[PDB]
Amino acid sequence: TGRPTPPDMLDGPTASVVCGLVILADWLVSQEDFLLERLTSLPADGSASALRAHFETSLRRIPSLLDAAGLKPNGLQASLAKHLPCLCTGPGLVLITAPMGEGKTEAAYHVADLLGKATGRPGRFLALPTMATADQMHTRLKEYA
DNA sequence: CGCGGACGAAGCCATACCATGTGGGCTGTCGCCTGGA
Ligand SMILES: [Fe+3]
Answer for the pair A122, A116: CB distance below 8 angstroms, yes or no.
Answer: yes
Stated in angstroms to one decimal place, the resolution of this structure is 3.7
Does residue A30 approach strand B to less than 7 Å at its CB?
A: yes
Binding residue per annotation — A104? yes
Cα separations in angstroms, A63 against A3, A57, A59, A83, A100: 24, 12, 9, 41, 43
Structural method? cryo-EM
Residues contacting A134, CB < 8 A, separation 6+: A128
Q: Could you tell me the distance, in angstroms and rounded to a whole number, from the CA of residue A49 to the centre of ligand 1?
A: 22
Residues contacting A88, CB < 8 A, separation 6+: A114, A115, A118
Q: Could you tell me the distance, in angstroms and rounded to a whole number, from the CA of residue A137 to the centre of ligand 1?
A: 38
